[PDB]
Amino acid sequence: MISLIAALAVDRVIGMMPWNLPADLAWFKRNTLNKPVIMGRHTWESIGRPLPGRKNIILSSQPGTDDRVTWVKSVDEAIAACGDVPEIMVIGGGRVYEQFLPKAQKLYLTHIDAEVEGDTHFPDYEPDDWESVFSEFHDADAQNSHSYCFEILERRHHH
Ligand SMILES: Nc1nc2c(c(=O)[nH]1)N[C@@H](CNc1ccc(C(=O)N[C@@H](CCC(=O)O)C(=O)O)cc1)CN2
Numbered sequence: 445m446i447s448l449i450a451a452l453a454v455d456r457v458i459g460m461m462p463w464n465l466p467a468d469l470a471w472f473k474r475n476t477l478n479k480p481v482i483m484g485r486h487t488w489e490s491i492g493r494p495l496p497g498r499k500n501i502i503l504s505s506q507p508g509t510d511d512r513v514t515w516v517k518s519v520d521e522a523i524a525a526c527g528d529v530p531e532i533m534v535i536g537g538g539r540v541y542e543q544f545l546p547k548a549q550k551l552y553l554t555h556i557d558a559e560v561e562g563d564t565h566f567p568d569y570e571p572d573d574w575e576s577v578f579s580e581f582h583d584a585d586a587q588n589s590h591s592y593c594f595e596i597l598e599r600r601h602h603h
């Protein structure tokens with residue numbers, strides 16, 4: 445099964461960080477550890493080093509040479525490279541989320557209370573097609589710059 449995981453500012457702006465949220469990074473790690481992660485080449489270059497404890501699959505029509513990750517050229521190849529696993533995590537960026545959304549059955553979202561200047565957005569999804577099965581709000585604190593709300597949604601309908 446395919447899931448997307450993303451952190452969204454107001455207006456669904458995503459980035460590679462205008463905010464400083466170690467709690468969100470802990471949420472990201474907890475929910476991706478021991479699962480393959482699929483990302484586009486822009487996201488890969490922004491991370492710079494393979495995420496530990498996860499198979500790192502990079503979707504790009506023009507692969508790099510880095511032997512530390514697995515390079516694939518299509519959504520279908522990305523999925524095949526993951527093989528028989530319970531859950532595949534798609535970690536962005538904008539275009540990769542857009543291509544994978546139709547195949548996804550679960551969303552892990554962090555809704556951040558920040559207005560920011562970026563131009564890359566998380567895909568449009570029809571809220572009526574999803575059910576909110578978890579939500580938790582957290583205030584900002586000495587370690588986290590903004591307030592945020594974790595949410596998990598499960599797909600109920602497809603169009
Ligand atoms: N929800 C959440 N989802 C996201 C992002 C986020 O920002 N938070 N940002 C994008 C993914 N980018 C990264 C880049 C680096 C790391 C990262 O470095 N993670 C460490 C945890 C950080 C640490 O404490 O060292 C890890 O092992 O997962 C996580 C997401 C897309 N989705």
Ligand SMILES: [Cl-]
Pocket residue numbers: 470471474
């Ligand atoms: Cl957590």
Ligand SMILES: [Cl-]
Pocket residue numbers: 483484485486487488536537538540
């Ligand atoms: Cl990308």
Ligand SMILES: [Cl-]
Pocket residue numbers: 585586587
């Ligand atoms: Cl505090």
Ligand SMILES: [Mg+2]
Pocket residue numbers: 509510511
């Ligand atoms: Mg090689």
Ligand SMILES: [Mg+2]
Pocket residue numbers: 538539542565566567568
């Ligand atoms: Mg889009």
Ligand SMILES: [Mg+2]
Pocket residue numbers: 542567568
């Ligand atoms: Mg769309």
Ligand SMILES: [Mg+2]
Pocket residue numbers: 572600601
């Ligand atoms: Mg319904």
